[PDB]
RNA sequence: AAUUAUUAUUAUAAAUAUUAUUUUAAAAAUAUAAAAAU
């Protein structure tokens, strides 16, 4: 009897003679709640068994006491937000004062440089992007500052928007406040605060494109592609007229064919086939708008549809270059495309789905569908599977509710 | 096509293959596929006709695997694995290992059994056999299966008759030709010429464990090199006969053998002079053996200027006179070489030449003549990537403007401390070059005062960077924290400089590029030190050669005396036989040396090598490897997947039926990288498919 | 039990195979080029075409 | 073997005729030279060792009827497995085994500690039942001595 | 970090780390009558105490370690101590006019005076290397620092703090008068010289606004 | 602080801890500071009598 | 019965509800349990 300590939290083997215990099933042991007599504080309320007692205090001074805000100060805070013009130019402002402090990436043979930290400017560009609502990974800011090629680009686009942003108003603003200030009516929302809708893609609102890509061609050449499917297409809210729209159109999907999504490869390449040709088809910008959207096709595997886009870019623009081997590029894979034509072989081709996989796919011994199948959002144990009937699954033995027999077995209801 | 060979006369007797292919189609094979199942599969089907082959062929042929081999270290050391069944480990010889020992086994019975002519006729061919069989190190085959020259395995040598070792048991090669190439240099010669009668000098020193040569093999074309001399009398001048004699002097030196006669006339008859008038003193030249060398000058001829063999060989005598006699020479064919303006003469005497003076006694005399011959200059001209700061560092005054060098009493560079006051200047930094390679080249002598501020200060081996670049790529890195530093030596510049094209594969000379790419370009940007010609003779014991292998330690022995604060690590490689400088290296056991060597002021920085302290204080840190990912062994046999080659699979597919879906066509067990198809074997019964790469 | 183990007795469990063999070994993996997931060879997905071929 | 403590770089290449000389007695003195003792610079941590080159094995003496009656015995593991064999029934085996058995009787005497010391200073003896031995490229030096 | 910065770091252990008397005595015991003599202090008892205690700054003896020697560091940190020591109120009433701030805030000038003091003294030596690769850009705060602490910018500090500045001045017009003639930085990526027009002309114009100042 | 402390000239120090000592013997550690040189702890044994 | 545990807690009433918890791809001893005869 009685070989450990006293405490109920002891070691050894104990007895209920000499130390005769209350059934505690779980407490919390000398060093604090695991995880497992949590699982309880955040569903039954209280530690299972039940002789202690829920201090549910301080997570009611972090939710509820920090989100009140009596009648009386409710109506009008809203009136005190900042005006996100500003933090656009100033911030635009700041993130550019760093932007031009950031290092050179060091060039020394043998061995790749280190990319400059990103601590400098993570700060104000949180503030840039968050007015905005497009978030950018440090990384497409942090690889250009390193990229030769890029490093100046990149800045000097700011310096410009910065200029056309302290020199127009931001216009993105306006075409939600003319909303509230068209339909003839005596409101403007505001004085419109952003100066001193029927307009198109506006100098900023051209300009905030610009350097959007060229954040997002620092993600390329890290090689970040669906973070910078992210940027692109996020600036797909910012063209009004089809002329840009089609061109940022032709971006989103030369950056959906890297980062292995080639379904929206084509839509987006497809955009640049209504909405490409309206200039002089001599300069390489003319043929772009139509290989994207046969490209990723010549990508997704069905060369027939491929086959007849390419022929159909050859018609309206005479010689692009990329088009015209496309044409060409399709004569190789004869026959062992078209001989060779099942309609399910599609070999998995880059990275970016290869990556995606390893990720967000399913995997082996856990994750799978045999551990905890999502119902609803509700993580269902694997027996609790609505989607079957098949053994383990408690739908086996259901029965029949003492209505209509519907079942013509013996053994199995 | 599946042509080749030809089954054996009596056909249904005897249904042995036979060999038809030309031996440049085998050699053809043997490189355009050096994996080791193609490798194996050429080595085997040509020692199979080796007694066909001309001895021109065979010339060949043995000349063609050394291709395969190095100098280095372990010989057939092709392993398989490292089997862990046990605590400790073991190492399997591949197929290849098995192969040369059975080449070797087929060289021993057509040279000394068979055909016993076949060797005297061709007298290139036996200079070759025996190079070859030193590469293939026979007379020590426990290295075929050591990995770490710490971790000596006795796989080839030791059984135990529970089984253990059995088939691999007391393996002996070529024992039996090796010692029937000896009874062929005793007692024929007269068809060899002297580039071969110091070639088979070259090859029975070089097999032999340590390079003593069983001096009646030796003491047999001494015999018949006099013979080839009397015809002459002994006033042989011409100008490649005065090379013969700089290489049976450097042989004659690895063997030990001390003939002062070659000397007596190498060096140009100083010695056997400096013995005529004498008031009262030694007669030290003449250590006579006169009845077994011959009496031998050169002539009224050249006498002088000569070759980079000579002096790195002057070093190991150790006379006085002899090296102020061989300074001289050294002098004089630094002048001849330079006025000829040659490049290769003028950097080869000098890494033959840092090994005379790191033999003198007086470290001034040495150190002198170091800055009068701009040999932190010229050394570092070769080295691949470093004819940038070759440039740099011999600025026009600070190449080597007379550092203070403060030698004290014993030659120790008591200096530390003392120059340590530098004079008070504090080595400058920026000086010129607009370009901004301004920042100067960080000399040790004058960056002592940066060591002792310098946190953990880090030592290169030439090891470290071989095998892969990613430990001193990090050490790169961390350079510019300014509390770490990193010292490289011209010494393993150079021996860097050697395995960058001197290098068995060019998986190995391609990092030793991009191993000096580094070093090279971060000692120009003024991060690393280097410790040049100038101060490897300013640390290094006189008296003692301290190659990079001890210059890695006498840097690590005296810097852990004179600046004791500040760490010190090592990359280098765990199978260098330089992580142990006590067990290797260590010196002749003497009475005097302590444990205490190496805090002692008066004692040389190398007596600490006889004590387990030195490695104490040398840390030796892996800093970063590259990462433990596995390779690609889908494409290897597996014991698993062995199984399933040949298994009815019937019911587990249902429409896309194939032939044989495991089975690879040509492969051993559908393993891709065991690859044998068109390769020699027999299967009269059984298909086999034609070579197609992957 | 007769003692108590010292450490260098707890680690000597870990020197056999029978302990490499159970927790510290790695298996060789691959991309299936259909199913896009890591794979060992000889499990296969569900989805008809990782079923009907079997990569 | 380099393994610092092991010292070949001093060596001296010693040759014992065993011709006549009692077989107790060959025995010591070349423990002397194996073990290094005769080095005026012995420490025991040192295994300073000189070659001894016993030839002429099978002309060994035993005063008396000591061939006859003393026992080289060894008791293994097995149960009952304890074996006596006289150095007239060890030399029908091997001539050698008798000298090798009363070297380590003398090797053992000074280092039976430690294995590292057991057993090399053995190897160090090469012991040849007649005149013929490899090592003529050793230069044995005949080591004078008077029992 | 035993010995707190070995060169780089300001954070060092002297006379307020102490010593704990009442632990296993980690390393460097190498003889056990280093129990009642321990006898640190003589150098050789000390390299191998001081190595294996607190570790000697390496992040692991692989891992990532910061880059604090280069100038693109130093100077961008230097900004942020005088940013933070004497925030820009002291500045303002510093800078434009001459009247006396207050008492205190007149300390809070000097308590950050030989604040510049500790951090020069400390990451000199590390200023002088990088200064051969420092760049333009940040050659060009090292006069703009000195201001904010309130210190007319024209071994010991003084002797290395002149020479280092007379050192930057001429690698500043340098630049500035290889700006007037430069070549082309990028002809691709960005051939046309933007942002560079009015960015460097600043410069040139903020580079001669301190010179009457110092 | 009770520890009298001395300073030699290759870096190298030394305390001797004078807590409740009088003053005759803060003087002797007094001596005792400028005698020694602080470079080796050695064990007088016959082996270490000569340190060359 | 310390329990969500060896359990039809049955004073009474009863007779065709499929009325809703039991993992595992090896070998021995043991443990339950098992065709043929003095």
């Known amino acids: ?413 | 096509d599946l042509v080749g060979y030809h089954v054996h006369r009596h056909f249904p007797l005897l249904d042995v293959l036979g060999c038809d292919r030309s031996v440049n189609d085998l050699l053809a094979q043997f490189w355009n596929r050096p994996q080791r199942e193609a490798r194996t599969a050429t080595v085997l089907d040509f020692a199979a006709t080796l007694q066909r082959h001309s001895n021109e062929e065979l010339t060949r042929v043995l000349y063609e695997l050394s291709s395969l081999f190095e100098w280095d270290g372990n010989g057939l050391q092709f392993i398989a694995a490292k089997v862990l069944k046990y605590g400790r480990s073991y190492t399997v010889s591949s197929e290849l290992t098995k192969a040369f020992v059975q080449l070797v086994d087929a060289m021993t019975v057509a040279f000394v059994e068979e055909q016993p002519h076949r060797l005297a006729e061709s007298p290139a061919l036996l200079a070759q056999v025996l190079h070859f069989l030193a590469l293939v190190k026979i007379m020590e085959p426990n290295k075929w299966y050591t990995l770490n020259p710490n971790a000596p395995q006795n796989r080839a040598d030791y059984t135990h008759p529970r089984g253990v070792n059995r088939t691999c048991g007391h393996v002996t090669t070529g024992r039996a030709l090796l010692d029937f190439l000896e009874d062929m240099v005793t007692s024929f010669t007269e068809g060899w010429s002297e580039d071969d009668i110091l070639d088979v000098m070259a090859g029975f020193s070089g097999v032999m464990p340590d390079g003593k040569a069983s001096s009646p093999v030796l003491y047999a074309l001494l015999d018949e090199l006099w013979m080839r001399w009397s015809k002459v009398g002994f006033v042989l001048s011409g100008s490649e006969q005065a090379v013969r004699l700089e290489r049976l002097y450097m042989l004659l030196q690895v063997m030990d053998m001390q003939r002062d006669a070659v000397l007596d006339a190498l060096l140009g008859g100083q010695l056997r002079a400096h013995s005529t008038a004498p008031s009262t003193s030694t007669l030290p030249t003449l250590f006579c053996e006169r009845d077994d060398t011959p009496p031998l000058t050169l002539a009224q001829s050249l006498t002088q200027t000569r070759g980079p063999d000579f002096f790195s060989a002057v070093s190991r005598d150790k006379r006085a006179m002899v090296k102020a006699a061989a300074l001289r020479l050294l002098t004089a064919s630094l002048a001849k070489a330079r006025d000829d303006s040659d490049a290769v003469l003028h950097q080869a005497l000098v890494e033959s030449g840092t090994e005379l003076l790191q033999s003198l006694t007086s470290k001034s005399a040495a150190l002198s003549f170091a800055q009068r011959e701009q040999f932190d200059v010229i050394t570092l001209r070769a080295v691949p990537h470093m004819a940038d700061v070759a440039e740099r560092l011999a600025e026009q005054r600070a190449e080597a403007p007379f550092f203070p060098l403060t030698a004290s009493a014993g030659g120790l560079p008591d200096t530390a401390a003392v120059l340590a006051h530098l004079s008070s200047h504090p080595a400058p930094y920026i000086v010129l070059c607009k370009g901004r390679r301004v920042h100067p080249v960080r000399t040790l002598v004058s960056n002592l005062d940066h060591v002792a501020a310098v946190e953990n200060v880090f030592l290169l081996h030439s090891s470290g960077v071989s095998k892969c670049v990613d430990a001193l790529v990090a050490v790169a890195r961390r350079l510019r924290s300014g509390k770490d530093a990193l010292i490289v030596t011209a010494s393993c510049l150079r021996a860097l400089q050697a395995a960058a094209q001197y290098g068995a594969t060019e998986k190995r000379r391609a990092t030793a590029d991009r191993a000096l790419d580094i070093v090279s370009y971060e000692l120009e940007a003024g991060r690393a030190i280097l410790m040049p010609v100038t101060d490897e003779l300013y640390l290094h014991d006189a008296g003692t050669y301290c190659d990079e292998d001890l210059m890695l330690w006498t840097l690590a022995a005296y810097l852990a005396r004179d600046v004791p604060l500040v760490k010190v690590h090592t990359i280098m490689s765990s199978r260098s036989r330089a992580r142990n400088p006590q067990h290797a290296l260590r010196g002749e056991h003497s009475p005097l040396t302590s444990t205490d060597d190496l805090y002692n002021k008066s004692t040389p920085l190398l007596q600490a090598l006889r004590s387990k302290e030195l490695r104490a204080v040398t840390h030796h840190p892996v800093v970063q490897r590259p990462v433990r990912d596995p390779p690609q062994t889908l494409y290897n046999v597996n014991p698993i997947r062995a199984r399933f080659v040949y298994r009815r699979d019937k019911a587990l597919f249902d429409k896309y039926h194939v032939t044989a879906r495991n089975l690879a066509p040509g492969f051993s067990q559908g393993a891709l990288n065991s690859d044998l198809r068109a390769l020699g074997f027999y299967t009269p019964d059984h298909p086999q498919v034609p070579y197609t790469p992957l | 039990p007769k003692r108590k183990k010292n450490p260098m007795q707890l680690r000597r469990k870990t020197y056999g195979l029978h302990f490499k063999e159970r927790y510290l070994k790695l298996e060789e993996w691959y991309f299936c080029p259909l199913c896009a997931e890591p794979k060992k060879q000889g499990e296969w997905c569900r989805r008809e075409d990782c079923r009907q071929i079997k990569p | 073997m380099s393994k610092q403590w092991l010292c070949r770089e001093g060596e001296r290449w010693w040759l014992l005729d065993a011709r006549g000389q009692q077989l107790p007695h060959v025995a010591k003195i070349a423990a002397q030279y194996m073990t290094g003792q005769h080095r005026p610079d012995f420490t025991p941590g040192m295994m300073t060792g000189d070659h001894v080159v016993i030839t002429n094995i099978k002309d060994a003496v035993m005063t008396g009827d000591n061939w006859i009656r003393v026992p080289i015995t060894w008791q293994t593991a097995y149960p009952g497995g304890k074996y006596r064999v006289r150095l007239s029934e060890m030399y029908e085996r091997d001539p050698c085994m008798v000298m090798w058995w009363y070297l380590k009787d003398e090797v053992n005497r000074h280092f039976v500690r430690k294995l590292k010391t057991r057993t090399a200073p053995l190897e160090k003896a090469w012991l040849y039942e007649d005149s013929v031995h490899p090592h003529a490229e050793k230069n044995p030096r005949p080591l004078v001595w008077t029992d | 970090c035993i010995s707190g910065g070995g060169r780089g770091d300001l954070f060092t252990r002297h006379a307020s780390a102490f010593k704990p008397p009442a632990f296993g005595v980690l390393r460097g015991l190498t003889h056990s009558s280093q129990t009642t003599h321990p006898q640190t202090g003589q150098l050789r008892a000390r390299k191998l105490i001081q190595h294996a205690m607190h570790d000697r700054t390496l992040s692991g003896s692989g891992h990532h370690r910061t880059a604090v020697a280069t100038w693109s560091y130093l100077l961008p940190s230097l900004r942020q101590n005088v940013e933070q020591a004497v925030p820009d109120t002291l500045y303002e009433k510093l800078l434009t006019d001459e009247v006396p701030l207050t008492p205190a805030e007149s300390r809070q000038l000097a308590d950050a005076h030989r604040l510049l003091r500790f951090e020069l003294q400390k990451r000199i030596g590390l200023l002088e290397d990088s200064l051969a690769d420092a760049a333009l850009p940040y050659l060009l705060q090292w006069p703009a620092l000195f201001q904010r602490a309130w210190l007319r910018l024209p071994g010991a500090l003084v002797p290395r703090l002149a020479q280092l500045t007379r050192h930057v001045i001429r690698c500043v017009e340098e630049d500035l008068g290889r700006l007037e003639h430069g070549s082309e930085p990028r002809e691709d990526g960005a051939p046309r010289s933007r942002r560079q027009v009015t960015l460097e002309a600043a410069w040139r114009a903020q580079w001669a606004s301190l010179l009457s100042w110092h | 602080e009770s520890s009298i402390t001395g300073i030699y000239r290759d870096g190298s120090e030394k305390a001797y801890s004078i807590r409740f000592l009088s003053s005759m013997g803060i003087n002797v550690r007094f001596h005792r500071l400028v005698n020694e040189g602080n470079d080796y702890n050695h064990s007088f044994s016959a082996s270490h009598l000569h340190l060359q």
Not at chain 1, 195 to 207: A, C, L
Not at chain 1, 301 to 313: H, L, M, Q, T, W
Not at chain 1, 384 to 396: A, Q, T, Y
């Open chain 1, 1 to 413: 009897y009685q070989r450990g300590s006293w405490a109920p939290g002891s070691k050894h083997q104990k007895h209920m003679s000499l130390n005769p215990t209350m059934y505690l099933y779980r407490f919390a042991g000398p060093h604090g709640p695991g995880p497992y007599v949590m699982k309880y504080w955040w569903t039954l309320g209280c530690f299972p068994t039940g002789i202690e007692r829920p201090f549910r205090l301080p997570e009611f001074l972090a939710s509820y006491q920090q989100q009140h805000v009596p009648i009386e100060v409710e109506e009008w805070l809203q009136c005190f937000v900042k005006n996100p013009y500003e933090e656009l130019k100033d911030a635009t402002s700041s993130l550019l004062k760093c932007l031009e402090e950031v290092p050179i990436r060091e060039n020394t043979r043998g061995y790749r440089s280190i990319e400059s930290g990103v601590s400098s400017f993570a700060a104000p560009l949180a503030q840039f992007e968050r007015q905005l609502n497009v978030r950018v990974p440090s990384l497409a800011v942090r690889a250009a500052l390193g990229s030769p090629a890029l490093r100046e680009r990149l800045k000097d686009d700011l310096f410009e928007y910065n200029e056309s942003l302290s020199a127009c108003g931001s216009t993105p603003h306006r075409r939600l406040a003319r909303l509230a200030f068209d339909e003839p009516l005596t409101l403007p929302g505001g004085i419109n605060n952003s100066d001193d809708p029927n307009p198109s893609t506006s100098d900023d609102e051209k300009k905030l494109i610009r350097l959007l890509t060229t954040f997002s061609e620092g993600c390329t050449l890290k090689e970040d592609y669906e973070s910078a499917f992210s940027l692109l297409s996020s600036s797909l809210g910012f063209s009004h007229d089809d002329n840009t729209d089609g061109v940022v159109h032709s971006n989103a999907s030369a950056a959906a064919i890297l980062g292995g999504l080639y379904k929206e490869a084509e839509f987006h390449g497809r955009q640049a086939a209504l909405l490409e040709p309206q200039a002089m088809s001599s300069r390489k910008s003319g043929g772009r708008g139509y290989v994207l959207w046969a490209t990723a096709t010549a990508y997704q595997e069905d060369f027939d549809r491929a086959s007849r886009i390419v022929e159909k870019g050859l018609e309206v623009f005479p010689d692009n270059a990329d088009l015209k081997s496309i044409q060409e590029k399709l004569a190789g894979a004869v026959p062992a495309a078209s001989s060779a034509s099942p309609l399910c072989t599609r070999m998995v081709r880059s990275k970016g789905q290869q990556a995606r996989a390893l990720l967000h796919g399913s995997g082996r011994s856990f994750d799978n569908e045999f551990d905890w199948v999502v119902f609803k959002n509700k993580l269902y144990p694997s027996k609790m599977n609505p989607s079957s009937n098949e053994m383990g699954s408690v739908f086996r033995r259901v029965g029949d509710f003492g209505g209509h027999i519907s079942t013509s077995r013996s053994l199995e209801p």
